Amino acid sequence: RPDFCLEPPYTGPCAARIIRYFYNAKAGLCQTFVYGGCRAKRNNFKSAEDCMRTCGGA
Amino acid sequence: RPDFCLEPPYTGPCAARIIRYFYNAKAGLCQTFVYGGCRAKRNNFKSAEDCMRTCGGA
Amino acid sequence: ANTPDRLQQASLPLLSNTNCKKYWGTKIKDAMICAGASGVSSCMGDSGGPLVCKKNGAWTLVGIVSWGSSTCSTSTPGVYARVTALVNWVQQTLAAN
Amino acid sequence: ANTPDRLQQASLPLLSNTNCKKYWGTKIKDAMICAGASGVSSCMGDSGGPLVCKKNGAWTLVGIVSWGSSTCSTSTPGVYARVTALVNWVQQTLAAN
Amino acid sequence: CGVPAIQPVLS
Amino acid sequence: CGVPAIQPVLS
Amino acid sequence: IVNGEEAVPGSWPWQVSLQDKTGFHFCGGSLINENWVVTAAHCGVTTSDVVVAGEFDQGSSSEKIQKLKIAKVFKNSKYNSLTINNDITLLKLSTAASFSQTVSAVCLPSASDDFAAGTTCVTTGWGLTRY
Amino acid sequence: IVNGEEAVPGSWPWQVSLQDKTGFHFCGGSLINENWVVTAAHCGVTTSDVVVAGEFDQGSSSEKIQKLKIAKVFKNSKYNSLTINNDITLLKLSTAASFSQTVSAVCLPSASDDFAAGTTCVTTGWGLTRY
């Protein structure tokens, strides 16, 4: 899977409180986190399904 | 909100690996966890939306 | 944690219902069979897989991984669906479909 | 980790662009205005809310909470959308809709 | 606009 | 049934 | 807001909470008249989100609030998603807010207004009080 | 399996992986013929899930596997979701498995078969090796 799937979730500099999903390679599945609204990294998805289709098994 | 929203997620005795959602009162939103497939507690939902409609703000 | 990538196996003994009930008491019902408590344990992700024994040189499905210790302890009996108690339902379902 | 239930407020000073750029350098663009670095900080969940100043006695929207320190440090400037640079767009949008 | 019916109190 | 083409090896 | 303080209830009556359809607060905004809210472009508001006016205590189930649907979102087309410049969006409400003691509009400046460096201003919201 | 060991690849050819539509493994199962898999009722399988046959290394993208759609789920109507008794479900495949060196069926017992206490048997799967 893409290495960006192994990066910790990135909230970024903006001050929003937006629920997103990231793949957690230690657990083997996608988890929610709070995203600030700008400068997303790639391990940042709007649905668990998108996240698991892109990073599942990394 | 219902007090069951404050309980930690419960995997139970069965040996499946089923993705479910629980409300995390410390974070203020629902998170994924792995459920064993039987004897679910009530803080156990099949979608983030169901979880947040039932427990959001607890 | 996360599951292993590669398929795992373990050898383990079948337990008598009496010895199984020494730990689980009345939670052991008539379509369950116990195995293990021997230093291995089924755990999350194993459910629904096989417990097989030899019968005349061929592997035969005796149990289906079902439930057990909620921390997958290797010193408590694992509990399996007892296929001999359920195989008539299996054959009837196949014959009708 | 979780937001306060009850609405919060903080007083804080507007910063000159020069003083804001002493920390943020060229990240400060022409429709941004800085405020704070004074012991308070906007933080996750504040975005899009107001930065108001009095104008002839009436509270007037000078900034919109936008971005800043990624740990919400209280000693660095908070950055806000600069409403004076954007209000012609606001009035045009209202007039057309 | 800009005149609250309930006055804010700011430390 | 029950006879794998690749024989299992068990400790 | 880190190191802020609790507001007097209702004393910032243009402050709105932007929430998803389950009630989850993700951004603030400001009423500028009975039909329009101004907020940040990076909040990513859609017509599925709602504007909650008149709120003080989001943990009070009995507070009297107005939950207002959004008819159309007007993101400034110059919003720069790389530099965060021009970070503004307008929300047109499908039903007008009803103004009251606790719900009313903030004033908007003129494009030529000068607000001097060092002016004491105020910001408000339900963002984190500790990171 | 805690404190098990790695299988010889392909040596348990009836072992299948039950996965959701993104490929996430949630349960095992056993082929009993080319059209049918037996698994646990509490796995909650639906026709949106898929049966993966012929697998050894779920982290290998190049392994030759058969991903098989499920036509119909037959959960034993006597499954007791309080006591977990009668924990069995059959999956009817919409396309037959193609039997081969690495894909084939486990035998089923007779209802009157006795398997004595103390018999050494084997269990297999991709479950946790550490809780």
Residue B52 has phi, psi (to 5 degrees) of: -75, -30
Does the beta-carbon distance from F2 to H106 stay under 8 Å?
yes
**Alpha-carbon dihedral sign for residues A5, A8, A9, A15:** negative
User: What gap in Å lies between CA C36 and CA D82, rounded to an integer?
Assistant: 69
Q: Which residue has the tokens 């290495």?
A: A3
Q: Is D37 in contact with D77 (CB distance < 8 Å)?
A: yes
Convert C64-84 to b/e letters by CB count within 10 Å (16 or more is b): bbbbbbbebbbebbbbbbbbb
Would you call D47 a catalytic residue per the annotation?
yes
Local structure of C44: helix, strand or coil: coil
Provide φ and ψ at D25, rounded to 5°. 55, -135
3-state helix, strand, coil in chain C (%, to 5): 25, 40, 35
- d(C-alpha C28, C-alpha C93), whole Å: 25
Residue F7, phi then psi, degrees to nearest 5: -70, 135
- The coordinates were experimentally obtained by X-ray
Residue with token string 């700008």 = A38
Angle at H35 between CA H32 and CA H38, to 5 degrees: 40
Question: Cβ H24–A49 below 8 Å, yes or no?
Answer: no
Q: Give the Cα separation of G75 and G87 in Å (integer).
A: 9
Residue H100 — left, alpha, or beta (φ > 0 → left; ψ -120 to 50 → alpha)? beta
- Residue of chain G whose Cα is closest to the Cα of E11: G5
Q: What is the DSSP letter of G107?
A: B
Active site residue G57: no
Shortest Cα distance, chain G CAs vs residue E9, angstroms: 6
- Chain C partners of H1 at a C-beta cutoff of 8 Å? 8-10, 40-43, 46
Instruction: Please check whether residue G127 is in contact with residue D47, taking contact to mean a CB–CB distance below 8 angstroms.
Output: yes
* DSSP assignment letter at H56: S
Token pair belonging to D82: 């600069």
Range(s) of the domain holding residue G100: 1-131
Indicate which residue of G42, G49, G113, G114 is catalytic.
G42
Residue D10 is inside which H or E element, if any?
A: strand D8-15
CB burial of H93-102 (b: ≥16 within 10 Å; e: otherwise) equals beeebebeeb
Largest CA distance in chain C: 42
Q: Which chains have 3 or more CB–CB distances shorter than 8 Å to chain D?
A: A, B, E, G
**Total structural domains within chain A:** 1
DSSP label at H16? Answer: E
Q: Which residues numbered 42-61 in G keep a CB inside 8 Å of some CB on B?
A: 58-59
Q: Say which residues have a Cβ less than 8 Å from residue D45's Cβ, sequence separation at least 6.
A: A15, A16, A17, D3, G25, G26, G27, G28, G125, G126, G127, G128
Q: How many domains does chain G have?
A: 1
CA quadruple H58, C2, H38, C89: dihedral, nearest 10: 180
Which of 15-44 (B) contact A at CB < 8 A? 19, 27, 29-32, 34
Distance of CA G3 to the CA centre of its chain: 20
- Nearest alpha-carbon partner for G46 in G66, G18, G23: G18
Residues of A with CB under 8 A from a CB of H: 29, 49, 52-53, 56-57
Candidate list H25, H42, H49, H114, residue with the active-site label: H42
Task: Give the Cα separation of B28 and C10 in Å (integer).
Answer: 42
What is the CB neighbour count within 10 angstroms for residue D52? 25
Contact assessment for residue D65 and residue G28, using Cβ atoms and an 8 Å cutoff: yes
Instruction: Spot the catalytic one: D47, D66, D69, D75.
Output: D47
G42 vs C83, D92, G45, CA distance in Å?
57, 21, 8
Alpha-carbon Rg for chain F in angstroms: 8
Resolution in A: 1.9
- DSSP notation for D29-73: -TTEEEEE-SS-B--TT-TT-EEEEEETTEEEEEEEEEE--TT--
H or E element, residue C71: none
Q: In chain C, which residues have their Cβ closer than 8 Å to the Cβ of F2? A: 52, 55, 58-60
Beta-carbon separation of G13 and E8 below 8 A = no
CB H41 within 8 A of CB H29: no
In angstroms, the separation between the Cα of residue A5 and the nearest Cα of chain H is 14
B12: domain CATH number is: 4.10.410.10
Decide: residue D95, CB within 10 A, 0-12 exposed, 13-18 middle, 19+ buried.
Answer: exposed
In terms of phi and psi (left: phi > 0; alpha: psi -120 to 50; beta: otherwise), the region of C37 is left
Answer left, alpha or beta for residue H58, where phi above 0 means left and psi between -120 and 50 means alpha: alpha
H47: distance to nearest CA of chain C, Å? 16
- Tell me, yes or no, whether chains E and F touch by having 3 or more C-beta pairs under 8 A: no
Give residue B32's domain range.
2-58
Q: Which residues contact G2 (CB under 8 A, 6 or more apart)?
A: D40, D41, D43, D72, D74, G128, G129, G130, G131
Please, are residues H86 and H79 in contact by the beta-carbon 8 Å criterion?
yes
Establish if G24 touches chain B: CB-CB under 8 angstroms.
yes
Of C6, E9, G61, C80, whose CA–CA distance to H84 is shortest?
A: C80
CA–CA dist D92, F9 (Å, integer): 77
d(CA G78, CA G69): 25
Chain A residues touching B34 at Cβ < 8 A:
27, 29
DSSP class of residue D19? H
Q: Taking CB atoms and an 8 Å cutoff, what residues of chain A touch C2?
A: 25-28
Alpha carbon of D59 to those of D94, G124, H96: distances in Å?
A: 21, 13, 72
For chain C, domain boundaries: 1-97
Closest listed residue to residue H10, CA positions, set H57, H52, H50, H51: H57
